């Protein structure tokens, strides 16, 4: 039975009914025209043109005969309609009882979402409830509608989100561009008694990882001077010894063996990288709440990380130089995070500002110390105080030959 084909049946009967009523109207309007002029105005146009007014007459007469079965029809019809009335009312109760049942389950599950203090809204025209699953945080804050699952007869939250699973994967790459080690972000498991709540967490977790990915993706465009490439699927940060750091959004023992030791190290690297990346994005989110109370360029998160790396690298290159030519040196860095009271402090601590590195290099035991204060900047740094003067140097290249000058004659 097609909905559109059900309409035709209705029109049919109502039209059979009309032509019947109208036919009765036609007969009586003709009969009345004999005694009133205005009465002929309810006869069909066709009848009006073809049949003259006062063409129907009537006489006093007839019994008419009384019918036997007709009085049994009247009794039957009434009795049949009154029992059908009971059946129908009892049918409509039985269906609507089970209808209130399935509605009861849906609302008991909805109370669980309100109990948890999750924001619930109705779209003006939708006439259906929706949760703000992206409640706690992130760039974009989307909602998901709650519905009864038609198949399993259970509940779920539908979303615009294109993925089931979504998590940031930061990995390291070979000279041959093989995965030397990786880290995919996980989440602390939250105990859920409600299947409806399980969904809400999974969705926030999905959206938040999408948010961090696109902010990372935006940053990649902003920093090309670090040789950073991107396909919108991967972010590749080229690092030392032809190695690469590939950042991507992932969607749908012995302890003494030198290779096993290295592998564990690279796991710690990727894990902390992911961990700092998330903390830094969190900080950027907190920054936006401050801004919303009164966005330019991109979030900082990817570049300070690059910066802190190149620091280890350049200071290590220096350590190599000073080792190659036996030179006693004391390397004293004061990392911002080292003195932090809590995590909200450590969050602000992960930043290029308030970072200095103090070096005391000894040309000879019988020569004065060369004090080097290293303070690099994100954009575009070496202060060397010796027995004679304080000198600032453009590059480590220059610093290294300035020391060379001080030692040589030995």
């Amino acid at each position: 039975m097609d909905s559109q084909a059900y309409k035709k049946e209705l029109i049919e009967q109502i039209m059979i009914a009309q032509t019947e009523c109208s036919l009765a109207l036609d007969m009586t309007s003709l009969l009345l025209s004999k005694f009133k002029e205005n009465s002929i105005e309810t006869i069909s146009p066709f009848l009006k043109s073809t049949v003259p007014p006062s063409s129907l007459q009537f006489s006093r007469s007839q019994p008419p005969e009384s019918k036997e079965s007709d009085a049994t029809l009247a009794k039957c019809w009434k009795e049949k309609s009154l029992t059908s009335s009971c059946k129908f009312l009892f049918e409509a109760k039985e269906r609507l009882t089970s209808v209130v049942e399935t509605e009861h389950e849906y609302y008991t599950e909805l109370v669980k979402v309100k109990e948890a203090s999750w924001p619930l809204f109705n779209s003006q025209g939708s006439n259906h409830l929706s949760v703000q699953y992206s409640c706690l945080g992130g760039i974009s804050l989307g909602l998901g509608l709650i519905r009864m699952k038609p198949e399993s007869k259970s509940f779920e939250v539908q979303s615009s989100l294109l993925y089931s699973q979504a998590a940031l994967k930061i990995s390291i790459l070979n000279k041959d561009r093989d995965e030397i080690g990786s880290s995919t972000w996980s989440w602390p498991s939250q105990n859920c008694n409600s299947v409806l709540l399980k969904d809400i967490y999974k969705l926030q977790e999905i959206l938040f990882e999408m948010d961090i990915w696109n902010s990372l993706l935006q940053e990649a465009q902003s920093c090309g001077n670090q040789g950073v490439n991107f396909t919108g699927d991967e972010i590749l940060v080229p690092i030392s010894d032809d190695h690469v750091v590939r950042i991507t959004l992932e969607t749908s023992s012995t302890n003494f063996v030198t290779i096993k030791q290295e592998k564990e190290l690279l796991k710690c690297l990727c894990d902390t990288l992911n961990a700092i990346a998330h903390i830094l994005f969190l900080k950027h989110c907190r920054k936006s709440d401050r801004r919303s109370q009164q966005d330019a360029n991109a979030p900082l998160i990817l570049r300070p990380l690059i910066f802190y790396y190149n620091l280890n690298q350049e200071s290590l290159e220096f350590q190599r130089w000073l080792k190659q030519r036996d030179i006693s040196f004391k390397f004293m860095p004061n990392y911002p995070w080292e003195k932090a009271k809590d995590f909200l402090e450590l969050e602000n601590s992960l930043s290029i500002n308030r970072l200095s590195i103090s070096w005391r290099i000894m040309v000879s035991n019988f020569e004065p110390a060369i004090f080097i204060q290293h303070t690099p900047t994100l954009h575009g740094v070496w202060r060397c105080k010796d027995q004679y003067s304080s000198n600032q140097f453009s590059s480590l290249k220059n610093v290294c030959q300035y020391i060379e000058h001080h030692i040589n004659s030995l």
């Binding site: 924001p119 709440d289 919303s292 109370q293 009164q294």
Partner: protein
């Protein structure tokens, strides 16, 4: 500078309800506490009056000397445009911040005599780069004293609601129109749970 505003009122019992609803709709809140002192020159013009303001929300209450210490601002709050309905009240305010040796000693040299003082207390919410403030004006224990408790204006004082948006240039066309264009979006947002009409200041 020009200040475009809308005024409404929230009762003493409905404060926790309107603030909980205001919290859940717009970005915020932020704690606002100010010590205001007004000075009048030696009919009378209300626009010729000078209004000082000191943000003491993060300041110590037992602190003795704070008039030369806590930051002060000079406000020249004029009168709003006459015959205004279905639209927002508009009044120009001339702002000037100061940092000097003595603030309380200078103000009397000009010829301005002490008239009155009021303390602004409440929360400030932000959405669409236009501000909405739910405050209450209280009377202190001693004159020019941050010593609590603070006495309200009446036994059961209500909460004055002030929705302010700024446009620094009167000559500006789109900037002056956008503050009014966004106050429609503000008015419609708070109108569902609060009351806001046009009041003359």
């Amino acid at each position: 500078m020009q200040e475009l505003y809308l005024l409404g009122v929230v009762p003493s019992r409905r404060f926790e309800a309107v603030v909980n609803s205001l919290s859940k709709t717009l970005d915020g809140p932020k704690t606002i506490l100010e010590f205001w002192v007004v000075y009048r020159p030696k009919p009378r013009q209300p626009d010729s009056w000078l209004r000082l303001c000191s943000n003491i929300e993060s300041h110590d209450e037992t602190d003795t000397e704070w008039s030369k210490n806590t930051q002060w601002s000079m406000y020249l709050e004029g009168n709003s445009e006459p015959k205004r309905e279905d639209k927002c009240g508009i009044r120009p305010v001339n702002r000037a911040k100061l940092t000097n040796g003595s603030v309380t000693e200078f103000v009397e040299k000009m010829g301005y005599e002490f008239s009155h003082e009021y303390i602004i207390q409440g929360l400030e919410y932000f959405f669409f780069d236009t501000t909405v403030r739910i405050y209450q004006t209280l009377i202190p224990s001693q004159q020019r004293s941050i010593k609590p408790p603070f006495h309200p204006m009446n036994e059961e004082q209500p909460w004055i609601l002030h929705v302010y948006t700024h446009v620094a240039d009167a000559s500006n066309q789109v900037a002056m129109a956008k503050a009014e264009a966004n106050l429609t979006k503000v008015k419609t947002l708070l109108s569902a749970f609060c009351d806001l009409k046009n009041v003359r200041l």
